[PDB]
Design an enzyme around this catalytic site. Structure first.
Site: not given
Ligand code: ATP
Ligand code: MG
Ligand code: MG
Lengths: 39, 274, 498, 209, 369, 240, 352
Positions: C57, C61, C276, C358
């Site tokens: 990306g 080319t 959060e 976590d």
């Protein structure tokens, strides 16, 4: 086996990281055998 | 080479006397204290019910939708079957033996029993595709031609794309038309965790069954029934008492068959019937 | 083999943006294609082939097409996978035919895309392998037989330089190896301008903010972003792409599209909200009090998006602060990581949940990297350890890329011999983790009204912004009693209109 | 097909005690799962006794409740089955309890002293270094929480011994049990249920704000 | 098919030969004075094997000795012998040795025997069976039966340890010549012989250039010549000088020099690290000779670097003292201590996390060595 | 019927005395050539079973079946086709064979011999397919004396010839080993020009066979010179 | 016929062909293998029919190990199937040899044995399995005096003495190695234009054939004084410890300080006959093993130990372990222990 190509900079190491791996494995196996065969 | 030997199974139609002989089968020693009481096996009982309903063209009158009586009778019959799949998958090959049940139930079946081998569709390796497609279409057309027929497909874990497309199309099309709806497409294997979930549809190859290893009383009963069917009267001292319970083993199939053959040969050598 | 002989490729260097270093390097090849006699009189031997290595990306080319268009020379583009067939020897014949056609029309530029398909290394970890080896040998023979004065330039594009055969990397085949890096903020700004020049744009869209806020995005990803925003504007029947369409496309690519009423119970949602909001509040408090060099909470959402039930967007700092990570900065980031479980402990008492384990994992690893790998404390250690669990750096989950990555040891691990130093290191790590956890619990417990108010506001609105959290912190000074919040008519109401 | 054992009184007793213990440890724990039916299936390969319990992110208290629940069948077999009649049926619950203990000590940080240290993760293939003299401390904590769970289950199941005996007898004589008859049993027989909050050790319990 | 045309490489076209060239002209004598060799009751050694690092010009050496011998030259890739089918390879080597036999006098060259010369029994597959069949066919063509005295094989391998003991048996591959890395004079000769084809100045002392590119192969010297052909358009000077080759050697040794935006404290930190490294490096005899000390970022190394060249003979032989290692660890402990002496223990950075691991690895290796 | 045992024990001898005593046709083949090529892999199994069936009651004897029914007969489909054909032929099951199971056309016993019975598949040694297992072991002292007498009849043995005193030197020998021993005794008796075979001839043959085992192939002169090469002080230690 | 590579198997086959005067058919194993199956069988059956037609005959098949490879795994490529088909066909040709009409003798030659399947070795196919190995010292004299017939020497007596001494100095070498050192001495004389094979020429040929050189580089390097000093001190320490503790079978011959090696450059006079070696010999070996470290620690101190001079007490510790575990003459016991796994944990502190 001591990294026969000399370092042109001091940042490079003097011996290869995988030079002494058999001795470490032997010591680890001996220590594990001593620990397992004692309890 | 399998097509010529499967086409020549029933070259001529069964004799009318053979039809009348096979249609009037009976219970044959279920309610005996020595061998194979009624409670012991529900799977072969359900298989015999399926074959017997298959015998009398009774899938073709699938349902009535009548006013009050015929519907209730058919509902009660439908319940009393299970406690009407036209194709049955069996998975019980954890121990030993596949022939000993299906040719056991196929001798009273009287319907042409045809076994198609999937391994022949693998050993043929734009011409191979044509050969396989023509071969499988001829197989299905012949199975239509000698309807009613019972098709056995052993080792379906082997299946490649052409036969999958054939079976998907056959199960999609030949269950709502093609008036010979009583075509059993029973199939066996030993790995039930490999088959794709697109073949477990209620219309396509549902209601799996299982077979376990033989227990010691089951071994005794199977031995007694295998010995009795050939005109050999078993001695009324080792099943009437605890005589041969302490010696018999081979706790699987193919062991009672071999032991019965050996013992019958030995008793034949002395010209004996017991 | 239809190698397209286009007189004008339609792409020039004006269509290339953010690849300025590689453009400057390849201007030498463009000049050589313009006047090869100037290189000839100086005795200058041009490179036989050039390897364009980089992530997909990045327009390698497109860069080659720009070189061909600027030079005004024939351009023979072909993919490496097209050389791999079933019949052995066809690929070598195609290679020979392509090189012959290039030699007929001199000067010319040959381009092989995805050369790693042909030049795969003979790894020691059908006849297709033999065919690939024969085609690679034919390519090596053709490249070695090139005379430098014939004016034919070979280019090979690759995404995995590790899979390439080192024979091609030898001098005489690939003399120049140019790394096409992802575009910078100015480069992404220029690429966004180029792609927005093709679509009707509203004046409220500020491309600089989205250029700065999307690091690592390739030009193709920016084009996909613009196209998706245009699709959103079509869906919303907008006459032009608004800033809301840009934000919606950004959120669609980053965290995914919003679902339709797929919500769990109130019990399993207040816990994620607590985690959060506690993390964001701890980060904001550490920014406010001790002037920590940490990131900033942009917005928090609890609506499921993609595969994440909740998210905290974090603004990424500049990379110059991502190298000299000092001990106070790492300790403050450890406090931020532990802030979630700190919030669960100060809000829900002694009955915590899994939703804060976590983060509790990452901190439990990070302190280890303080003591073993980096050796920041000064009882010196003798060996490091590898991470037993490895987690990829990613989106709205916490940054964990302050030193480039968190779960990537820089080959600084050795097997242990003495096992007493291991338990000493474990004791020190437990002490440090417990001390930091106690510190962040003490910090969070001193501000309970602000945390609970932010939790209730986020639970009502299902989204909140960082400036809203800052306003909650300003309106709620430390050590306010909880009855002030509990006596309000609606705790989940904010009087601030952004 | 044919059941592996005949339908007698001696064979049904371990499975009846098993199912009754599971039902009692399900009922006595507050806010836990709810049982629907219990039955003794003659031809079930999993076991003669069968129990259907439907559950009502999980917290620490729910895990402690599950750990207490994992001992109910084994404790029921201990008090009810005669000596010489031991059980291999409850071994799978014992292994699950041992797994739960090491999980909530190492992974989630819900240790006996509430330590936030984490030694294992969901994607991990191994644990941390953990030294040589520090594994004994972790083992001691796991044994401590396992013993606390066993003591709690024993304490809450020795208070309803007559209830458990009545459930065993009624399951043996009826072979089919609903939730309503079990509610009747825990009502008339003086079934002393537990009460919230449910902690495995009340020495460190706090409350929400 | 396997024959080449236009062989003109001689001993003059190749550089850095040394006494190996003597052995090379022995081959010329083996192809010229062979009647005196045969009259003295001596069998011609048909097997010579050139072993060394890649890039030393093994194919160039084969071309040179073939051109000086004045006979037909065969050079064939060994990877063509290995095939997914079995049988074609044995026929190919049979036809190869047959066309070499009828084209006598001739010398043949087969490169990279490591594909076909592996031990029998290291891989279990049909490819291994084909390799064994081809190895046995070449074994029986080389020595198996009588009838070859005029064809000589030339081998070029990088790993001689994989060679079959059957092949190195006397009579098949007896002469073993090692071509090593070029030292000093070989680098001068290779650079000059690759630089004949480019206009060059008379003030060009290549001694400093080769003193920079120590321990590099001849292909790398050709690369150094290759970075001395184009890059001068940016300044636009007249003739190739010393400093251009010095900068080219610096570029091919480390990488391209790139400049990026930076703060002042970052430069201070990097320069403090380099200062500690150089200051501790000064006070020890093991790395006293310091040539360069910079803090410019390069490709792959944002940090600075220092350059030291003590004589490279003790490291190869292994004669390094204990005091030689205990100092070096101290040198690798130069950065972190400086941090402790500059920013305090409470504000230690993470730039020395690599040299500190080198120090601990060296300490462990010295302990267990 | 599955025959097992050490090689060179004469299992085909048992098969041939079975054929001679039965007075019935006896189809004899070898299992090494059944995995021949792509022209007919599994067709030979069908042909040889059909040849047996057309002359039933008969027997079929295949030697060294380990090349067909080995543990690697499922990895290779070429071996698998022959193995599946073999399994199909040994049963009845009229479909795919086209014949009634119980008739004169099925009185065929599949006789197989091998040297390593542990290398066979479990499904081939499964009961019903292989019913009897016979392990033919190596002969013994008196049997070895009789084998020596049989294989050393037409030679001029001297008056000092007696194999009863050399039985312990031939433990584990088969008939072929004793035949080779007799032949080598004849060769060595010719070698010294002796007209008959002495006991010393057989003793020296066995001694040469034993000394060749450890890698010592020396004539008399080299042995004597090497014995004289060593000293006397270091020889008395070995003597003691 | 088999054995070590390059011993003279095919040379003996040529000798058989020359001495027999019989129809001889030489063939190669790899000649028969290709993709297409059945052509190997066709070629070998044409060979066997030819041998039967001109019976009696000697068919020699060089390198049987190519076709004769045992199945060592699944043959995906299909070459193994062709190899096995050819093998079984040739075995049928051997079994078709009737003792009344086929006087055809099969002579083989191979270098490896474990790759062959145990099918060709059956009686009636390959009865005699002879191995030609490394010859004895008398065989070494015989093969060199055969090989030194066309080589010019100064005189016959000096030729005999020099060939005898190089025979005493070519132990564990095959006949190929002896003819190689003779040929290389001839090459050296031809380079130096000397009409007779000299003494230094033989010495240098043997030196290059025993592989002393491994670097293969231009030997011109300025050696420092601090290197020659360490080498001379190490050699002096070895000389002193060897003279003080003499070995009955290995006396000192020469000493040089010109080459760098892990072990000292010492040379001893080998004397075969080591039937006996007492415990004092083991103790003296342990003492002499740790020589280079002590001298450098004494003269130069501990801070000047080299890497190759510090790896000396490890060999002494290994010899001490060998004495303790595998001699039974110490107080550790009178058992024999192989180190890997039959060492109970009780014996570990005693060994240490
Ligand atoms: N006993 C001997 N007398 C004389 N020359 C010998 C003798 N043994 C070996 N040679 C030499 O060995 C060479 C032939 O070796 P030979 O062909 O026997 O090896 P090989 O057994 O075929 O090895 P490989 O099987 O690896 O080819 C001859 O050139 C010959 O000079
Ligand atoms: Mg046999
Ligand atoms: Mg040979």
């Amino acid at each position: 086996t001591s990294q026969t190509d000399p370092p042109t900079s001091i940042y490079k190491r003097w011996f290869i990281k995988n030079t002494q791996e058999k001795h470490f494995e032997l010591l680890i196996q001996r220590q594990r055998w001593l620990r397992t065969n004692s309890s | 080479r399998e097509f010529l030997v499967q086409f020549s199974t029933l070259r001529a139609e069964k004799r009318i006397d053979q039809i009348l002989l096979s249609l009037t089968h009976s219970d044959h020693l279920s309610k005996n204290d020595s061998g194979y009481q009624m409670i012991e096996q529900p799977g072969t009982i359900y298989l015999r019910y399926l074959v017997d309903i298959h015998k009398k063209y009774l899938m073709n009158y699938e349902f009535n939708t009548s006013c009050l009586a015929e519907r209730r009778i058919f509902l009660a019959h439908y319940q009393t079957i299970t406690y009407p799949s036209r194709s049955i998958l069996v998975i019980g090959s954890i121990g030993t033996g596949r022939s000993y049940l299906v040719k056991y139930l196929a001798t009273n079946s009287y319907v042409p029993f045809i076994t198609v081998f999937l391994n022949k569709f693998l050993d043929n390796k734009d011409m191979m595709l044509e050969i396989d497609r023509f071969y499988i279409t001829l197989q299905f057309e012949l199975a239509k031609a000698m309807s009613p027929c019972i098709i056995w497909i052993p080792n379906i874990h082997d299946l490649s794309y052409l036969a999958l497309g054939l079976l998907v199309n056959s199960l999609s099309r030949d269950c709502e038309r093609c008036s010979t709806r009583n075509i059993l497409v029973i199939a066996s294997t030993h790995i039930p965790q490999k088959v794709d979930p697109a073949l477990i549809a209620p219309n396509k190859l549902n209601t799996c069954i299982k077979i376990r290893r033989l227990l010691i009383p089951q071994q005794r009963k199977h031995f007694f029934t295998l010995s009795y069917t050939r005109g050999f009267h078993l001695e009324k001292k080792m099943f009437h008492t605890n005589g041969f319970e302490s010696i018999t083993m081979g706790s699987s199939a193919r062991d009672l068959v071999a032991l019965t053959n050996e013992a019958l040969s030995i008793s034949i050598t002395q010209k004996k019937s017991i | 083999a239809e190698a397209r002989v286009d007189g004008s490729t339609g792409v020039k260097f004006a269509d290339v943006a953010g690849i300025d270093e590689a453009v400057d390097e390849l201007q030498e090849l463009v000049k050589y294609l313009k006047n090869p006699d100037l290189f000839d009189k100086m005795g200058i031997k041009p490179p036989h082939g050039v390897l364009l290595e980089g992530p997909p990306g990045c327009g390698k080319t497109l860069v080659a097409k720009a070189i061909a268009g600027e030079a005004g020379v024939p351009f023979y583009q072909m993919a490496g996978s097209e050389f791999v067939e079933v019949l052995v020897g066809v690929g070598s014949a195609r290679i020979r035919d392509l090189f012959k056609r290039a030699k007929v029309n001199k000067p010319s530029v040959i381009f092989i895309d995805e050369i790693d398909a042909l030049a795969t290394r003979r790894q020691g970890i059908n006849a297709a392998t033999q065919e690939r080896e024969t085609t690679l040998n034919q390519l090596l023979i053709e490249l070695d037989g090139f005379d430098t004065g014939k004016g034919v330039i070979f280019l090979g594009a690759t995404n995995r330089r590790d899979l390439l055969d080192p024979a091609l990397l030898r001098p005489g085949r690939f003399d120049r190896k140019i790394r096409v890096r992802p575009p910078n903020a100015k480069g992404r700004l220029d690429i966004l301008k180029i792609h927005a020049s093709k679509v009707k744009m509203s004046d409220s869209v500020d491309l600089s903010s989205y250029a700065s806020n999307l690091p690592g995005w390739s030009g193709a990803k920016l084009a996909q972003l613009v196209q998706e925003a245009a699709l959103v504007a079509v869906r919303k029947t907008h006459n032009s792409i608004l800033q809301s369409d840009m934000d919606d496309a950004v959120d669609r690519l980053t965290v995914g599209p919003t679902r339709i009423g797929l919500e769990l119970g109130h019990q399993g949602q207040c816990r994620r909200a607590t985690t959060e909001v506690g993390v964001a509040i701890t980060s904001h408090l550490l920014l406010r009090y001790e002037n920590a060099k940490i990131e900033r909470c942009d917005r928090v959402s609890i609506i499921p998006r993609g595969q994440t039930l909740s998210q905290v967007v974090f603004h990424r700092l500049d990379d110059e602060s991502y190298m000299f990570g000092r001990l106070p900065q790492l300790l403050h980031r450890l406090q931020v990581l532990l802030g979630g479980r700190a919030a669960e402990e100060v809000i829900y008492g002694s009955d915590t949940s899994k939703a804060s384990v976590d983060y509790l994992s990452d901190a439990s690893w990070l302190a280890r990297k303080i003591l073993t790998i980096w050796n920041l404390e000064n009882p010196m250690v003798i060996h490091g350890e590898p991470p037993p669990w490895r987690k990829r750096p990613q989106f709205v989950g916490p940054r964990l890329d302050f030193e480039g990555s968190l779960y990537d040891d820089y080959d600084l691990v050795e097997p242990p011999v003495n096992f007493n130093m291991d338990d000493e290191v474990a004791h020190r790590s437990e002490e440090l983790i417990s001390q930091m956890y106690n510190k962040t619990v003490s910090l969070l417990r001193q501000n309970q009204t602000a945390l609970l108010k932010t939790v209730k506001v986020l639970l009502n609105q299902k989204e909140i912004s960082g400036e809203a959290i800052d306003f909650i912190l300003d309106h709620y000074p430390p050590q306010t009693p909880l009855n002030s919040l509990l006596q309000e008519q609606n705790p989940g109401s904010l009087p601030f209109v952004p | 097909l044919n059941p592996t054992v005949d339908w007698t009184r001696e064979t049904k007793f371990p499975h009846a005690v098993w199912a009754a213990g599971r039902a009692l440890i399900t009922l006595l724990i507050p806010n836990f799962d709810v049982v629907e039916n219990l039955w003794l299936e003659p031809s079930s390969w999993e076991g003669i006794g069968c129990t259907k319990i439907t559950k009502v992110t999980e917290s620490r208290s729910y895990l402690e409740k599950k750990l207490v629940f994992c001992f109910g069948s084994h404790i029921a077999s201990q008090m009810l089955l005669p000596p010489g009649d031991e059980n291999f049926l409850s071994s799978s619950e014992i292994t699950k309890a041992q797994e739960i203990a090491t999980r909530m000590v190492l992974q989630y940080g819900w240790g006996p002293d509430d330590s936030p240290a984490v030694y294992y993760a969901t994607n991990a293939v191994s644990a941390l270094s953990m030294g040589n003299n520090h594994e004994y401390e972790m083992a001691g904590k796991v044994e401590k929480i396992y013993d606390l769970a066993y003591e709690k289950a024993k304490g809450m199941l020795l208070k309803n011994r007559r209830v458990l005996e009545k459930i065993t007898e009624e399951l043996l004589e009826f072979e089919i049990l609903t939730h309503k008859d079990l509610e009747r049993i825990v009502h008339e027989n003086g079934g002393i249920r537990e009460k919230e909050p449910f902690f495995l050790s009340g020495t460190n319990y706090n409350e929400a704000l | 098919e396997y024959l080449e045309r236009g062989v003109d490489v001689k001993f003059t076209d190749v550089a850095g030969l040394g006494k190996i060239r003597l052995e090379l002209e022995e081959i010329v004598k083996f192809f010229t004075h062979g009647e005196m060799y045969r009259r003295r009751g001596v069998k011609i050694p048909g097997g010579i094997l050139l072993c060394g690092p890649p890039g030393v010009g093994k194919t160039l050496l084969a071309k040179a000795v073939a051109g000086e011998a004045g006979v037909n030259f065969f050079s064939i890739s060994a990877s063509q012998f290995v095939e997914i089918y079995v049988g074609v390879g044995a026929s190919r080597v049979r036809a190869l040795y047959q066309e070499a036999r009828e084209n006598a006098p001739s010398v043949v060259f087969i490169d990279e025997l490591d594909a076909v010369g592996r031990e029998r029994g290291l891989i279990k597959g049909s490819g291994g069976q084909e390799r064994d069949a081809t190895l046995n066919q070449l074994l029986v063509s080389l020595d198996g039966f009588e009838g070859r005295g005029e064809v000589i094989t030339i081998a070029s391998t990088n790993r001689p340890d994989i060679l079959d003991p059957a092949l190195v048996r006397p009579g098949r591959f007896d002469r073993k010549i090692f071509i090593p890395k070029p030292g000093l004079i070989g680098r001068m000769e290779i650079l000059q012989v690759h630089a004949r084809k480019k206009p060059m100045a008379e003030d060009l002392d290549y001694m400093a250039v080769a003193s920079m590119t120590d321990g590099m192969v001849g292909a790398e010297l050709a690369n150094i010549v290759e970075i001395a052909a184009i890059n001068m358009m940016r300044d636009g000077r007249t003739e190739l000088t010393t400093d251009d080759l010095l900068q080219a050697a610096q570029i091919e040794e480390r990488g391209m020099l790139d400049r990026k935006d930076r703060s002042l404290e970052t430069w201070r930190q990097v320069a403090i690290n380099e200062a500690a490294m150089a200051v501790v490096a000064v006070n020890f005899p093991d790395m006293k000779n310091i040539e360069f000390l910079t803090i410019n970022p390069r490709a792959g190394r944002e940090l600075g670097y220092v350059r030291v060249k003590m004589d490279h003979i003790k490291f190869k032989e292994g004669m390094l003292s204990r005091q030689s290692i205990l100092d070096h660890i101290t040198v690798q402990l130069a950065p972190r201590a400086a941090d402790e002496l500059w920013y305090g223990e409470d504000q230690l950075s993470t730039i020395w996390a690599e040299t500190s691991d080198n120090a601990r690895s060296a300490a462990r290796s010295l302990v267990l060595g | 019927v599955l025959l097992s045992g050490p090689p060179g024990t004469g299992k085909t001898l048992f098969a041939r005395t079975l054929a001679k005593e039965s007075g019935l046709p006896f189809v004899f083949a070898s299992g090494a050539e059944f995995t021949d090529s792509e022209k007919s892999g599994a067709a030979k199994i069908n042909e040889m079973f059909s040849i047996a069936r057309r002359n039933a009651p008969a027997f079929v004897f295949v030697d060294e079946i380990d090349a067909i029914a080995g543990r690697h007969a499922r990895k290779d489909p070429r071996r698998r086709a022959t193995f599946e054909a073999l399994i199909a032929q040994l049963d009845g099951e009229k479909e795919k064979t086209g014949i009634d199971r119980f008739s004169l056309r099925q009185a065929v016993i599949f006789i197989c011999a091998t040297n390593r019975p542990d290398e066979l598949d479990l499904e081939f040694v499964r009961s019903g397919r292989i019913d009897r297992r016979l392990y033919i072991g190596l002969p013994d002292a008196k049997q070895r004396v009789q084998i020596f007498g049989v294989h050393s009849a037409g030679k001029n043995l001297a008056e000092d010839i007696d194999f009863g005193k050399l039985v312990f030197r031939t433990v584990g020998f088969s008939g072929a080993d004793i035949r080779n021993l007799v032949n080598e005794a004849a060769i060595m008796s010719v070698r010294k020009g002796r007209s008959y075979i002495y006991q010393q001839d057989i003793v020296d043959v066995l001694d040469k066979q034993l000394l060749e085992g450890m890698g010592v192939l020396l004539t008399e002169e080299e042995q004597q010179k090497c014995e004289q090469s060593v000293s006397y002080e270091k020889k008395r230690l070995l003597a003691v | 016929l088999h054995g070590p590579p390059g011993t003279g198997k095919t040379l003996l086959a040529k000798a058989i062909a020359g001495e027999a005067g019989l129809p001889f058919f030489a063939a190669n194993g790899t000649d028969f293998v290709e993709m297409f199956v059945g052509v190997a069988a066709s070629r070998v059956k044409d060979l066997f029919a030819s041998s039967r037609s001109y019976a009696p005959s000697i068919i020699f098949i060089d390198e049987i190990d190519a076709i004769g490879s045992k199945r060592g795994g699944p043959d995906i490529g299909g070459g193994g199937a062709e190899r096995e088909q050819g093998l079984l066909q040739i075995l049928t040709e051997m079994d078709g040899f009737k003792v009344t009409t086929s006087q055809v003798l099969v002579i083989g030659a191979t270098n490896r044995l474990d790759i062959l399947d145990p099918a060709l070795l059956r009686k009636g196919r390959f009865d005699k399995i002879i191995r030609v190995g490394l010859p004895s010292k008398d065989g070494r004299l015989a093969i060199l005096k055969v090989h030194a017939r066309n080589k010019f020497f100064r005189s016959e007596d000096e030729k005999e003495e020099l060939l005898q001494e190089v025979a005493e100095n070519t132990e564990d070498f095959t006949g190929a190695e002896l003819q190689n050192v003779l040929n290389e001495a001839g090459i050296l004389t031809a380079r130096k234009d000397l009409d007779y094979i000299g003494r230094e020429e033989l010495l240098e040929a043997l030196k290059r054939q025993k592989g002393t050189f491994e670097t293969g580089q231009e030997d011109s390097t300025e050696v420092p004084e601090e290197l020659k000093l360490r080498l001379a001190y190490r050699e002096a320490a070895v000389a002193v410890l060897a003279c003080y503790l003499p070995d009955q079978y290995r006396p000192i011959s020469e000493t040089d300080i010109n080459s760098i090696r892990s072990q000292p450059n010492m040379r001893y006079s080998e004397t075969s006959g080591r039937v006996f070696a007492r415990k004092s010999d083991y103790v003296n070996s342990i003492i002499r093993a740790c020589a280079p470290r002590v001298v450098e620690e004494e003269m130069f101190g501990i801070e000047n130990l080299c890497w190759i001079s510090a790896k000396s007490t490890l060999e002494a510790s290994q010899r001490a372990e060998f004495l303790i575990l595998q001699t039974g003459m110490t107080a550790f016991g009178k058992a024999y222990y192989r180190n890997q796994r039959d060492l109970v944990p009780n014996l570990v502190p005693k060994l240490e």
